[PDB]
Write a sequence for this structure.
């Protein structure tokens, strides 16, 4: 049961880290447009 | 203790899912701003 | 081990909340530009 909790936390971290990456990509595309 | 942690984990999973839905809507918003 | 699980969850909650603040700032920039 503690391993299952550890796995859920690790999967949530993975999801959020990808989320952060997609947000970084959006900000970069907006910067290219404003400076285009 | 166990139930209090599960409650917070479930709330965090729901928050991260809503976080993704917002990010997808902003992506469409940026695309429209560039396309105009 | 339990304390480490609690510490991980709290760090993930703080990270998602910082994520939300950054998304809100991006949304405000997109709203300002699309109606400006
Ligand atoms: O504040 C500035 O420097 C940038 C220049 C392009 C749009 N805004
Ligand atoms: O960020 C600021 O300080 C101002 C107040 C709203 C619009 N920009
Ligand atoms: Cl601009
Ligand atoms: Hg998140
Ligand atoms: Zn175990
Ligand atoms: Zn276009
Ligand atoms: Zn708008």
């Amino acid at each position: 049961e503690w391993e299952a909790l550890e796995k859920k936390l690790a999967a949530l971290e993975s999801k959020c880290q990808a989320x952060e990456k997609k947000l970084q990509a959006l900000e970069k595309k907006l910067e290219a447009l404003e400076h285009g």
